[PDB]
Ligand binder design. Structure first.
Ligand code: POV
Ligand code: POV
Ligand code: POV
Ligand code: POV
Ligand code: POV
Ligand code: POV
Ligand code: POV
Ligand code: POV
Ligand code: POV
Ligand code: POV
Ligand code: A1EBV
Ligand code: A1EBV
Lengths: 617, 617
């Protein structure tokens, strides 16, 4: 990455800056006596700070910590309060593009100087001073560190709970404060949080602290600049631990019960009927966590992300309620559409007229749905290798070719077999999408979807750049026969040599040495080295490479089948009419202070291994 | 899963119920003074309990434990004994379908309230109050928790030995009590027990406690509702640790010697001749543990389940006594029957008449045995992939086709070669069952039995749905020749195109471009993409998939060969006559109190690694 001018370097006002660097208080005593009357005519002490970047000696002293630093800070504060400029001195900000709005308290917090940090707030800091800068607000994740550009989140993004308690007891803190990105403190903790369970992580523990110290719902209901309360921000950023904690969170103490999400009912040993609350989980309005966690591409930790308590049961109930009954209906009504293509294609005209226009209207419906589905998606969705747009595009082609054929048939262009036969061969090959069910058979289609995109195009490109060179050479090595007989020089042209040299790869045809070549010792050399270099090397090294690929992705297939299952589960939801949406879940709990707690789904989960380990002691 | 109305919720009699919920004794003082004369006219205190589910305030207070709960229980008991309804109050039962017969002591035990549990039995509990309900007695294993529906097993199914001791010293406990499922306490411990050795498990330790406190044989000889003393219940449910403990169990103390099963004789270092007792182990009557552990499908922990001391030696002795000598006899007498089919099939009539009806009578015997064997099995046995019914069905077909052929031969239908040649080709292919012996060769047949059922039908179905679409398209792309020559359009019909397009897959035949097609650029595209998509992708991705399958199941083959070996060992037992069963094991030990301890098999086992590790200290 790149940055602007540095915040500190070591390449008569510079003498104070050099004195506060190493922290020489004995040297720092006398220059301030000199500075009290240094050009005391009128300047309004602007020479105390620097004008190139807005730096003062305070944040320069806190920029590099030495064992003697407290005396420097107290001497600087005692000097600043003499000239009645302490408010302007402690509220000093950087004035560059990378760093803008940076205060001395912001640097004091991050240097683990909790004892020093109490001094600036005692002198009076604005606290709410944002840090809107290019460094503090990076574009990607590799040119800076992000912390919500608020000083309170410094003690939150870095494990400093004592400064969190010190800032909480302040009268002017503004816990419900936005920023330039519109985030809040909980959004900041969501962003810094670590997805994988890597032993102890302070973010999950400190979320409880900040939320219990808030004691209200405004911190978890405010939206981002795009608009995201942190429940789905933890989903989009790919944070499994934080989402698991926020989805299943209950407070066993009174006076804090509205913040709870998982109201337990009874714990009868291995069984525990937990009444879960869902308000941004079910796809009711938009941007639900269930919708975000399935329409995402960059997430790699979806092994454990989909199998939470208010998501797995929700998906299973949706599948058993309205997804399987329509999946089988779609399978039957597409198999019939593919079968009625055989009665038109194979039985072409070289009372069975009831199905002549059924294929036309169903191709029209398929096209008018896939045209919406292909532009509703963004180009970022196709960047993933296992994207769902490939089948959405194949299904679209299967409709455009059919409608083009039936358009050209009655227009009499003699092309009613050009696009209809390709539509046929693609439609029978399109049946490997409706194997989303049948778990054992569903294991098999993603092997296609991964192997063909990982090993087939690479070996195909190598074999194409291999066959092209040998094809030109073998066609150039032969000689033109004097046309006394037509059966001369079987490797006649480049197009014929390509076919005759490709037939040798599969294993059908014949091999000859008298191909009207004046250099048989050279013809045979090339013909032998082609089969040696490709059939002995490439055709079986491909097998060896997929022997590693399938071994690597055999344990990964279980989650990637369930991903396609959940995607086609939620895709059929959008196709429902609004009046058919009456089959919602259980809701209107009314077990809160003065309202109804949205919708609350009752699940009855059991865990016998965990209960066996717990009861073992 | 689903459930009935919940046992507790938080959505002038309800005030007492709310007071006992959080356990506010200071609030609980005055309402009872109010309730003493509340409508004291005559109701016979029915308002103290609820009528919707039969709940009282006692089990509601024990439903959620708070640090102050003992005073609530003692105040409720002191109030109930005043109105002389303590017996009806403490013997209160739930009255719904899911929960029926549930008492307050049952809820007090499971909440780890051992100090509270002594109070209700001191007041007087019926103890033997069953919990016959749909929740306590689930159908499958995923809609409830099962514990034998007796309160004594609550302290047994949950690790609470102190309450076991408290219930044992009671005068009215009825240790030999059945239930609605006919189980006993040992059956309950067998059901809850954990099969794999997962560090410490309280069930195996507490079995010793309950059996030594019983001190008799009635607890381990009572049968289930179907009829199972727990030795084979531990076998059918798949519990390796519990079965290992119960099979090899000895008490070194006097006054408890009839309960012992493994009477040791001498321990001469690495060798220890252990005299084992077998009463429900040998297949003498029915339902032996050895018979149950081999005729089971759902068990996955049979790696260590078959190799116990009174089972492995029993199987080895049976094999060396009467199973190998009949296996070789069956192999010879079936190879002769398959060889004498060649002298009839290949030498058909387009003094060798001694073998013309031998095949007929042996096919009759094979059919009359396989017809019994195919309906003696249940449909649950065929659900397993590696079931023994496939060979039992192939052997049956090999007899029905032969008898149909020899029936149609002398009836003169000219079909004596239609079913006889298929019977021949199936009979020579049926020889891959008699490779149960030859350990290295026996490793090879289960590779067939697994690979063909896991990878062959899936790739075959994909290749069939692939070849069918290209077959119709390639046959439709060609044009009908004007019949001036017969050698026109080699891809003539669909049936011919299927064969010509299948010959390209194996690698024999020829490839041409002038197939009387008006669209050669389209014919060649389909012909090239078929070989690309199938021979380059499917035919070798199958190899890559079995490269993972064989690697995964290479370590699993050792147990699955021995499973077929034990199954064909015990299958030949049933074929023996009753008079031939005189070759039993050693029995009539008479080393017990006043009887003969059934049969007792002497084995001489050695263990040098264990003795080397033991003597090392
Ligand atoms: C304005 C007018 C039309 C636009 C709105 C049309 C609404 C109805 C669409 C019906 C339809 O496409 O049928 C579908 C079946 O669906 C069923 O079986 C249920 C009906 C058929 O299409 P599909 O099975 O969805 O196609 C499979 C591929 N995909 C799942 C990747 C898309
Ligand atoms: C080739 C693949 C074909 C896939 C077919 C669709 C499908 O998923 O089938 C499903 C069958 O689905 C049914 O049982 C549907 C029954 C018809 C419902 C029609 C409306 C009834 C409305 C009435 C008012 C299979 O789904 P499953 O049985 O849940 O899969 C799990 C079983 N497994 C582990 C064996 C795989
Ligand atoms: C007449 C027999 C054909 C049917 C046999 C079904 C046997 C029971 C199902 C079964 O075992 O599933 C099979 C699927 O198999 C399929 O999904 C088959 C699909 C139909 C193929 C039809 C070809 C014509 C095997 O799948 P599995 O059980 O997941 O395999 C276990 C994996 N392991 C063997 C490596 C441990
Ligand atoms: C019209 C589609 C063709 C292009 C498809 C590109 C798809 C995106 C890139 C992509 O996934 O890279 C592919 C490369 O693939 C190549 O490098 C292709 C080279 C060109 C082949 C042209 C043949 C004609 C795959 O490479 P990868 O992503 O490193 O593979 C991940 C490995 N894993 C699958 C085992 C996990
Ligand atoms: C990707 C493949 C890109 C090339 C495709 C070539 C297809 C065949 C082709 O046109 O070959 C061309 C060669 O031209 C060559 O051989 C060019 C080789 C370098 C490119 C021409 O091949 P042809 O038509 O058999 O030659 C007849 C000569 N005529 C075209 C003047 C009548
Ligand atoms: C493993 C990887 C497999 C290989 C990978 C790909 C390799 C392929 C090489 C295939 C060899 C045969 C083609 C050359 C011969 C031929 O007929 O050429 C034709 C062109 O034909 C095409 O242009 C076909 C379309 C492109 C290739 C097929 C798609 C590949 C997709 C991926 C035309 O030839 P011509 O000379 O103009 O014919 C004169 C016409 N006349 C006789 C009717 C008068
Ligand atoms: C009332 C009248 C008849 C019913 C009762 C008939 C009793 C005798 C049966 C003999 C018999 O089937 O021979 C057997 C050999 O067996 C021997 O070699 C020992 C004899 C031949 O059959 P098998 O070798 O058992 O067949 C192998 C396949 N199986 C083991 C899966 C079944
Ligand atoms: C093809 C497979 C063929 C299998 C043949 C049967 C069989 O299991 O053979 C057996 C041979 O069995 C004998 O030795 C039998 C001797 C004939 C007994 C006939 C009655 C005698 C009665 C007289 C009164 C082989 O069994 P095994 O030698 O115990 O196998 C272990 C050796 N291994 C590790 C080398 C594999
Ligand atoms: C599993 C396979 C199920 C189909 C088996 C087809 C076998 C061949 C067959 O009957 O083809 C049929 C086509 O019909 C088709 O091509 C149907 C394709 C869709 C099914 C007919 O094929 P054929 O008999 O060669 O055509 C002669 C026409 N005649 C039958 C009117 C005389
Ligand atoms: C790797 C996977 C391998 C492939 C998997 C399976 C693929 C198989 C495709 C096989 C291609 C050849 C069959 C078509 C040609 C033929 O002779 O058809 C015949 C039908 O023949 C049958 O119906 C055969 C039985 C079914 C297929 C074989 C069992 C597959 C089991 C699994 C009859 O054809 P016809 O037109 O009626 O003949 C006229 C008769 N005359 C000439 C005598 C007058
Ligand atoms: C296997 C799969 C998912 C797609 C293959 C379809 C090919 C392109 C047929 C083309 O005619
Ligand atoms: C390999 C094995 C166990 C069985 C194959 C027998 C096949 C079905 C021959 C059919 O004719």
């Amino acid at each position: 990455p790149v940055f602007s001018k540095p915040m500190d370097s070591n390449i008569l006002k510079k003498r104070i800056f050099a004195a506060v660097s190493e922290g020489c208080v004995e040297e720092l005593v006398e220059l301030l006596v000199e500075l009290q009357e240094l050009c005391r005519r009128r300047f309004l002490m602007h020479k105390l700070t620097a004008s190139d970047t807005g730096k003062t000696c305070l944040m320069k002293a806190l920029l590099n910590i030495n064992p003697n630093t407290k005396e420097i800070v107290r001497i600087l504060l005692a000097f600043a309060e003499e000239n009645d400029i302490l408010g302007r001195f402690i509220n000093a900000e950087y004035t560059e593009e990378a760093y803008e709005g940076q205060t001395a308290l912001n640097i004091a917090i991050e240097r683990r100087q909790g004892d020093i940090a109490a001094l600036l707030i005692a002198a009076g800091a604005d606290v709410n001073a944002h840090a809107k800068g290019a460094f503090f607000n990076p574009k990607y994740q590799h040119e800076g560190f992000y912390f919500g550009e608020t000083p309170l989140a410094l003690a939150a993004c870095t494990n400093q709970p004592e400064i969190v308690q010190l800032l909480m007891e302040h009268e002017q803190t503004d816990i419900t404060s936005r920023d330039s990105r519109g985030n809040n403190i909980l959004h900041a903790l969501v962003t810094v949080a670590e997805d994988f369970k890597t032993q102890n992580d302070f973010v999950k523990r400190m979320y409880d602290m900040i939320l219990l110290r808030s004691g209200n719902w405004e911190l978890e209901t405010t939206r981002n600049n795009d608009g995201l309360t942190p429940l789905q921000l933890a989903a989009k950023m790919g944070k499994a631990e934080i989402l698991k904690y926020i989805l299943s969170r209950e407070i066993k103490e009174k006076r804090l019960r509205s913040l709870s999400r998982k109201f337990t009912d009874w714990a009868y040993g291995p069984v525990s009927s937990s009444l879960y609350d869902l308000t941004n989980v079910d796809t009711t309005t938009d941007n639900s966590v269930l919708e975000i966690t399935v329409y995402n591409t960059n997430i790699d930790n979806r092994h454990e992300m989909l199998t939470l308590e208010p998501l797995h049961t929700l998906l299973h109930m949706k599948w058993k309620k309205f997804a399987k009954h329509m999946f089988f209906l779609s399978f039957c009504f597409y198999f019939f559409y593919n079968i009625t293509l055989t009665l038109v294609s194979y039985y072409r005209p070289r009372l069975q007229l009831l199905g002549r226009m059924f294929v036309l209207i169903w191709a029209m419906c398929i096209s008018v749905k896939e045209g919406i589905a292909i532009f509703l998606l963004r180009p970022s969705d196709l960047q993933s290798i296992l994207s769902d747009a490939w089948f959405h595009f194949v299904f679209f082609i299967q409709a455009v070719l059919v409608i083009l054929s039936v358009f050209l048939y009655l227009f009499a262009y003699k092309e009613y077999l050009a696009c209809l036969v390709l539509a046929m061969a693609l439609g029978w090959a399109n049946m490997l999408y409706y194997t989303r069910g049948f778990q054992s058979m569903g294991m098999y289609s993603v092997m296609i979807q991964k192997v063909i995109l990982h090993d087939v195009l690479k070996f195909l490109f190598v074999y194409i750049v291999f066959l092209l060179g040998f094809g030109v050479a073998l066609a150039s090595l032969i000689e033109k026969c004097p046309k006394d007989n037509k059966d001369c020089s079987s490797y006649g042209s480049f197009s014929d040599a390509v076919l005759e040299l490709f037939k040798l790869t599969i294993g059908l045809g014949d091999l000859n040495i008298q191909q009207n070549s004046k250099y048989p010792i050279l013809f045979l050399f090339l013909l032998i080295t082609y089969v040696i270099l490709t059939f002995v090397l490439l055709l079986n090294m491909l097998i060896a490479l997929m022997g590693e690929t399938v071994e690597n992705v055999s344990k990964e297939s279980e989650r990637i089948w369930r991903l396609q299952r959940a995607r086609t589960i939620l895709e059929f939801e959008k196709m429902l009419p609004e009046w058919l949406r009456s089959r919602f879940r259980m809701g209107e709990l009314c077990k809160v202070a003065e309202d109804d707690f949205r919708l609350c789904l009752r699940i009855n989960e059991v865990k016998w291994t965990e209960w066996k380990t717990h009861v073992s002691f």
